[PDB]
Amino acid sequence: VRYEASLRQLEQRQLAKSVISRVQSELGNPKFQEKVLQQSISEIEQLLSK
Amino acid sequence: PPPVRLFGVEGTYATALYQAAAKNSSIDAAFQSLQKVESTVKKNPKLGHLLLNPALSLKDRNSVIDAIVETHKNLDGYVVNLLKVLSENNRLGCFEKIASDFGVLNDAHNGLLKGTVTSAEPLDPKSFKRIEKALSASKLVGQGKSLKLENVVKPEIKGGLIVELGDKTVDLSISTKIQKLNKVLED
Amino acid sequence: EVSSILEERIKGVSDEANLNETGRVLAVGDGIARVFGLNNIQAEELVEFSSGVKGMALNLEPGQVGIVLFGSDRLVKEGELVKRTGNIVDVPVGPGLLGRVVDALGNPIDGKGPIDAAGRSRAQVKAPGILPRRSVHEPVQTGLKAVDALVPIGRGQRELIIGDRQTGKTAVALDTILNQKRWNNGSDESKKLYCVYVAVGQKRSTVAQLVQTLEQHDAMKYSIIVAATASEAAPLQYLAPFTAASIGEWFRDNGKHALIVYDDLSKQAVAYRQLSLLLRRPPGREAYPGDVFYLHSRLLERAAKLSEKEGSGSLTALPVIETQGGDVSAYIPTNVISITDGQIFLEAELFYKGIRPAINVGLSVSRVGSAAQVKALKQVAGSLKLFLAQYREVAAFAQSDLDASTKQTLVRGERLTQLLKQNQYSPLATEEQVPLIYAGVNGHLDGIELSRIGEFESSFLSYLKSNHNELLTEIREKGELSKELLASLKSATESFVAT
Amino acid sequence: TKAQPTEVSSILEERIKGVSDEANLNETGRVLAVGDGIARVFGLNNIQAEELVEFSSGVKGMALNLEPGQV
Amino acid sequence: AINVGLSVSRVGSAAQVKALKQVAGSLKLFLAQYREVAAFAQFGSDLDASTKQTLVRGERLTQLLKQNQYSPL
Amino acid sequence: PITGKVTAVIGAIVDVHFEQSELPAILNALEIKTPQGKLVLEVAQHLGENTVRTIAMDGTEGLVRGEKVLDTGGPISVPVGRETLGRIINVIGEPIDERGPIKSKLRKPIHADPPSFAEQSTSAEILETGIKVVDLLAPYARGGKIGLFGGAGVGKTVFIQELINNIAKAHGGFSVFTGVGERTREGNDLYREMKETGVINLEGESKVALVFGQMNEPPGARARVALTGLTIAEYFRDEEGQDVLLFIDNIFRFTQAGSEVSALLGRIPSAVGYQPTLATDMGLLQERITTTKKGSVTSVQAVYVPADDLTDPAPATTFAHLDATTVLSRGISELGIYPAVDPLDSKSRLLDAAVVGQEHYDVASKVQETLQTYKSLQDIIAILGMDELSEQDKLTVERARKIQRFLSQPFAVAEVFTGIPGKLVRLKDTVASFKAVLEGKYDNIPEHAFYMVGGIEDVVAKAEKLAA
Amino acid sequence: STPITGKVTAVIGAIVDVHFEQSELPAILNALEIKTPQGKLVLEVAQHLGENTVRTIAMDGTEGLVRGEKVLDTGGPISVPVGRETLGRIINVIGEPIDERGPIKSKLRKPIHADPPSFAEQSTSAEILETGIKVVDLLAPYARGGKIGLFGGAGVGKTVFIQELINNIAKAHGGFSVFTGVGERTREGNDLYREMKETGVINLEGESKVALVFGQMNEPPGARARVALTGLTIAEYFRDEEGQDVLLFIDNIFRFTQAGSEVSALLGRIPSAVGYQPTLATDMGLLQERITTTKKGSVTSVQAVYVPADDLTDPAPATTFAHLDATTVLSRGISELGIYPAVDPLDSKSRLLDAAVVGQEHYDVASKVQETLQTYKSLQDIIAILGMDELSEQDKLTVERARKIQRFLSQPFAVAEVFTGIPGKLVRLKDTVASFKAVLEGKYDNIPEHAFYMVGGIEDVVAKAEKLAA
């Protein structure tokens, strides 16, 4: 009964580490180039408005 | 006069040097001579090691000054009055610290801004220019003070970028977002 | 499943670009990060980190501005952003914190009910004027007979509950909150004290009893419990009495009353000490800072009974002060004692002697006191002060046998003392406090054995409800005893004493 | 390295701007930090021990600590 | 100088000789009771037999206890 | 004047750095423009390089380094005159009471230098009141310091009110009641009470002017309020030649606040946990209080003990300055005697043969002696019983009880409660009464028939009325 | 980039400073390790002083720390082992076995730090501990959830008290336990280790009913501090993940307070409360909150506490008194009188004592006792001066029952077979309530004082009436 209760929490924790697992793929893939740049241009649009 | 006062940690010396040569408008000349004498101190290994180490007597610090001015041409006599004032006060412990703080004073008063554009990666020259403009639109950079920016690669940001200057930043780094993404999947 | 709820929340989080002024930690130690930058920044203004820690700026100086960290030192490192939120510490105030246990920050930590807010008001404000004031004359009933008659309680009237450690300090206080349930049930909202209990540097285990006991008696639907616990850091504990009073101000300004019970200023002081010593502030008495006085004084002068202009409302207060065996000559007790008007001083001996509450009412005085007192209770217990007062001094004579006079005084005092021994967490109405004391005064209770006192109390009460609950309701609502009620009241005690 | 009370920007700016390091440190002083009932004058290096100095304000005081750079 | 009133061993004993434990068996209680009785004894109050028993016993022991410099035995 | 930018905000200690020429002089008042009203800061050191170190008078919140500062040219200037009376003012000389800007023809600085040697109280002076007990056994003096003792709300308020009332009749004078460590709830009550008993009038001028120093204002605003009331008093003395009476509240909370001012400035707070500049500050305060040739400020101050100790540094420094002590107690009040004065604990160091003439001293000694002998006798007279009284012994009992009752004033301040018309009994007329009672020329007049009357004239009436 | 190189800069006792390289960015609460002949010296970062330079506390010796010697960065707090296979092994403060039977078995590890459980997690008590000691059981019983504290001076049998509770209570309950030794002598460890090995609470196979964590005082002040955080972590693991009640024990927790006080001055944090760490409230506060009853396990600690100078109106014990639920007070005098244990009858107090929680009869009986003794103590003054025959007959009888009660606190123990030599007793909660009551009702004043001396339960009291008569 205790461990079953614990298990619903663990299930979420497995999805936490999974974020890390996609993170690895981003820095290996040319997402490392393209999304850094998605990030860059938005900063350009916000800062021009100041 | 200074563009803003800086006090303590051997910057009271820098403020005093700046203001002294500023009232005589011989600040380019101060910068040039200081760069020259520092440049030859830094690229001589033990002289750039044991001069910051304040293991000398009174009499010896004075004898140091005399050896330093052989490598100096004597281009300005004020940064040489700085060597004399340090030797009399019984220190030579921080040299690039006095220098660096003075470096900030001269080019800020002149109007030159120092930004950083940390990114995880090399970026477009298009980007530099676009950002340079983004800044000019805004009040950080209005001219009366130039713009320089340095793209750096630090794996301390592992995607995205951070713009910094005049303590106003725009922070679109992927790391901080990865941290909040964790937080919600930990309920 | 759960993931879906979280999925809902995730989408509601986006990339945020624009941020204002910033600083970078130069060195961080002992919860004292020291920041480079933040030139132009308000005094004691809030900062938010890049690792999501919060801070306040006690130290402003040009070289470095010395932030004080509220959270962890493990998420703060060297070279980290410190965004300037641009808002001095202020916390939400509303009516919605009724029935809500909140942390020092105002969010629900029990996980029950949302915070319905309307404004955010600063933790530190400044105390109203001279013209925003009116004399204290409003009673308040605590349900203990002794406190309401000998050293009455009032509205915007603060007076101590200073006593020894685990002698039922909390029981003196708890009885009052539970009694404020009486006004709450009706609908005249200028008589409703919306109570706040402020647990400062007092652990979550102790508080869990505090909440549990409230819940059983159905009293988490107006009580508010602001908690900065033993584990929670010195800023939160330092700011816990300031956050709690401010919630009370919304009620007070809208024209209402509310009541704040601080527990305990002995622990508020300890937190200021921790802060001072790490920021190397001047030393003082007992190794606590010299400037502690200023802290307490600012908090206690906002507790006041305002003009009719300000809606005819007040912030009533009752600080609880923890003593080290009854020392009042101690630097932190001594400050508070002068500031506040009145004290109640509990005694260790009474406790051991099995009388609980161990409130000792000889060494209790209220400076303002009976100006706030029910008329009914003033008549039948003027006498009551003079009877108990003699009995103490005449109880410095001990048994063989004594003068005919001296022995009489002990008999009268003792029956009254057993009457005023009551079980804890049991409040009393005005209609049941007033009949009993009259029995003591008029010596129909002091003619009856000590052992049978406890019995007499309930029987007499039931006897009055069965025959004539008209006289009780009349007593209560008039608030006073008239010659026609005083005739009757003697008649009734006689029939009851007969049986 | 060491912190010194001779890091005063008004003193320092004048020493640096010549070979001159002030002739106002002989038989004259100029006041700096003063109040708390104790005062700090910069210079006075020709002075005697337990001497009287008269300040141009109509107040006179007695040198207690003759220190190298201040009295 | 020696005082036995404020002389304790927290853990408890086991390090003495077997023979010395028996002989001093109740010596500890006598001396500890005696102090209290001795204090009462000085007011000059009349004392009952239970109190004077303890007072007569205790006193004699205390005189045993007393020693002179340089007697190893 | 010169302008500069705030360069620190540590605690309530704000350092301001000014454009290079000179700095403010010490004790000057600086004004900060902010959306928190104004904040008046007082310079208590010069750090050098055109920078200062200041104490605050108004809470330190809503400051930013870089706010422009202004130098007034000297101390904080408080209004003075007779257009400021009956109105409550905080440390900056502006209303708390919200009756509209407190302004007058002239302002004067809170810090001043004490008068010359020549212009001090150099010969004896006598300050006449209406109370018999004060005027016989402890004569109030001009430039005299009398340290009040006992608690608040048992007679204390009644006593303060009385003397304010006496002064108007005696001279035409004024008073300023200064409250240090004042609680704001209590302050409203004192101003409303002071109106009722007739010493503050809602229409024009009044008598007493009120100065309150709240605890929700920094330690400096508690410290400088005493100075704020003094300036008002002095204006009457110097330029209108009128005698004044200047109260202080608790002198513990003047001490408590000054410790914080010391510790904060850089200084060490050592003096058994209090300031080492304590003696010297009381010296400045209580040496501007004196009799000048045109007028005189006299001061009544209040002693609060730290834990029932007269051996502590703060009680001790006060006791040296003080020339008399007046001791109110509750026991006296419960025997129906208002003033609450204790004639056994009523003493002055200006009660002498050559200070109040010979007659005044010698009657006072007897009046003291009767009551002392009555007390010694009374110890064994109660125990033995009231019939083991001697003929000799009962002669001391009888005289004392005549004196005990006779002291009482049915005075104007506590008039409502007893119902009996007010009394002012002058100093000469106090002495005279006591002479006839000493020779027993009223041993035909019953003991209890000395009840609630003043001078010699007064008790002629009560004697008849008891018989009738 | 994170350097794996630091060079030591200043060894000034326990304080060890490191000079890390470019880009390190130091963070507090990390662990630096230095290779040394005495193993791996662990340094817990407790400040960064700026520019890549930490000021750290040592957990191992610095009488052989060489300057210039490479300092790795490990990161975060150290990780000990937890499980159920971590029972009946002796675990060092740095997490290493000094019981020398290969490594301390693992499944999972967690660090010596843990965040304190939130308000929502907390839950009340509902079970009542029974110790089997008649004074504790009537006048202040403990309940699971509690933070018990054994306040006393020195010489009042502190270890012996702690020993008694393990001899009874530990076997009894269905849960496992954790025994943590903070800063204690090499004699005491060995005494605990032999006595309970024999009693089978320590077993060489895992899955015991105690754990042992010995941290000792001949190790630097930082180690004494973090022996406690280490043992505690085993108990949290029980409580949450493995869902078992713990009957935790810590000893002496003053060594924990005293330890923080030593490294407090040197880290720059000027003393407060006079000679003590200014962080006294919060360090306690964090410690105490971990030990509680939540949604699963109930970790009920028994903590020894040392009162210095035998005076308990001193700031270090007084702060603590607040932090602990169910205080007891012990003293030199009572122990010497022959009354075992030295627990005082009126000064043993719980905040877990209610009239309903321990039942009405129990409450009423313990109140009568508190009254009768208190009359006895008021009468002591009268009896000293006036004499004993100038007392009323009601008074004289109260003196007499109070004497019977006073000697009815005396029970010998097995672990105090170094004092009396008579084994221990087990006394059930109902049996204490009934036998005290009988004295007070006047029906059991036929029994003398010495027949309540050295007794167990009720059956015993009857047995001793016969023995003395013959």
UniProtKB/Swiss-Prot annotation, chain A:
Assembly and oligomerization: F-type ATPases have 2 components, CF(1) - the catalytic core - and CF(0) - the membrane proton channel. In yeast, the dimeric form of ATP synthase consists of 17 polypeptides: alpha, beta, gamma, delta, epsilon, 4 (B), 5 (OSCP), 6 (A), 8, 9 (C), d, E (Tim11), f, g, h, i/j and k.
Protein name: ATP synthase subunit 4, mitochondrial
GO MF annotation terms: proton transmembrane transporter activity
GO cellular component entries: mitochondrial inner membrane; mitochondrion; proton-transporting ATP synthase complex
Keywords carried by this UniProt record: CF(0), Hydrogen ion transport, Ion transport, Membrane, Mitochondrion, Mitochondrion inner membrane, Phosphoprotein, Transit peptide, Transport
Misc: Present with 12900 molecules/cell in log phase SD medium.
Family: Belongs to the eukaryotic ATPase B chain family.
Taxonomic superkingdom: Eukaryota
Record flagged with keyword Ion transport: yes
Subcellular location: Mitochondrion; Mitochondrion inner membrane
BP-aspect Gene Ontology terms: protein-containing complex assembly; proton motive force-driven ATP synthesis
Curated annotation (Swiss-Prot), chain B:
Compartment(s) of residence: Mitochondrion; Mitochondrion inner membrane
Keyword Ion transport applies: yes
Gene: ATP5
Family stated for the protein in its record: Belongs to the ATPase delta chain family.
Name assigned to this protein: ATP synthase subunit 5, mitochondrial
Organism of this sequence: Saccharomyces cerevisiae (strain ATCC 204508 / S288c)
Additional observations: Present with 32400 molecules/cell in log phase SD medium.
Family annotation (Gene3D superfamilies): N-terminal domain of the delta subunit of the F1F0-ATP synthase (1.10.520.20)
UniProt subunit comment: F-type ATPases have 2 components, CF(1) - the catalytic core - and CF(0) - the membrane proton channel. CF(1) has five subunits: alpha(3), beta(3), gamma(1), delta(1), epsilon(1). CF(0) has three main subunits: a, b and c.
Keyword Phosphoprotein: no
Swiss-Prot record, chain C:
Signal peptide positions on this chain: none
Site entry (Required for activity), positions: S364
Superkingdom assignment: Eukaryota
InterPro entries: ATP_synth_asu-like_sf, ATP_synth_asu_C, ATP_synth_asu_C_sf, ATP_synth_F1_a_nt-bd_dom, ATP_synth_F1_asu, ATPase_a/bsu_AS, ATPase_F1/V1/A1_a/bsu_N, ATPase_F1/V1/A1_a/bsu_N_sf
Subcellular location: Mitochondrion inner membrane
Pfam families: ATP-synt_ab, ATP-synt_ab_C, ATP-synt_ab_N
GO annotation (BP), single: proton motive force-driven ATP synthesis
Residues holding ATP: G163, D164, R165, Q166, T167, G168, K169, T170
GO MF: ADP binding; ATP binding; proton-transporting ATP synthase activity, rotational mechanism
Broad class of the protein's primary localization: mitochondrion
Residue numbers carrying Phosphoserine: S14, S135
The entry's keywords: ATP synthesis, ATP-binding, CF(1), Hydrogen ion transport, Ion transport, Membrane, Mitochondrion, Mitochondrion inner membrane, Nucleotide-binding, Phosphoprotein, Transit peptide, Transport
A Gene Ontology cellular-component term: proton-transporting ATP synthase complex
The keyword Protein transport appears for this protein: no
Record PANTHER family: ATP SYNTHASE SUBUNIT ALPHA, MITOCHONDRIAL
Subunit description: F-type ATPases have 2 components, CF(1) - the catalytic core - and CF(0) - the membrane proton channel. CF(1) has five subunits: alpha(3), beta(3), gamma(1), delta(1), epsilon(1). CF(0) has three main subunits: a, b and c.
Note: Present with 41500 molecules/cell in log phase SD medium.
Family statement: Belongs to the ATPase alpha/beta chains family.
Name of this chain's protein: ATP synthase subunit alpha, mitochondrial
Organism of provenance: Saccharomyces cerevisiae (strain ATCC 204508 / S288c)
Gene assigned in the entry: ATP1
From Swiss-Prot, chain F:
Top-level EC class as recorded in UniProt: translocase
Transmembrane segments: none
SUPFAM superfamilies reported in the protein's UniProt record: C-terminal domain of alpha and beta subunits of F1 ATP synthase, N-terminal domain of alpha and beta subunits of F1 ATP synthase, P-loop containing nucleoside triphosphate hydrolases
Coiled coil: none
Cellular compartments per GO CC: cytosol; mitochondrial inner membrane; mitochondrial intermembrane space; mitochondrion; proton-transporting ATP synthase complex
GO MF term list: ATP binding; ATP hydrolysis activity; proton-transporting ATP synthase activity, rotational mechanism; proton-transporting ATPase activity, rotational mechanism
Catalysed reactions, as listed in the record: ATP + H2O + 4 H(+)(in) = ADP + phosphate + 5 H(+)(out)
Gene Ontology biological-process entries: proton motive force-driven ATP synthesis; proton motive force-driven mitochondrial ATP synthesis
Residue(s) carrying Phosphoserine: S333
Top-level taxon of origin: Eukaryota
Subunit: F-type ATPases have 2 components, CF(1) - the catalytic core - and CF(0) - the membrane proton channel. CF(1) has five subunits: alpha(3), beta(3), gamma(1), delta(1), epsilon(1). CF(0) has three main subunits: a, b and c.
Family per record: Belongs to the ATPase alpha/beta chains family.
Annotated HAMAP family: ATP_synth_beta_bact
Protein name (Swiss-Prot/TrEMBL): ATP synthase subunit beta, mitochondrial
Gene behind the chain: ATP2
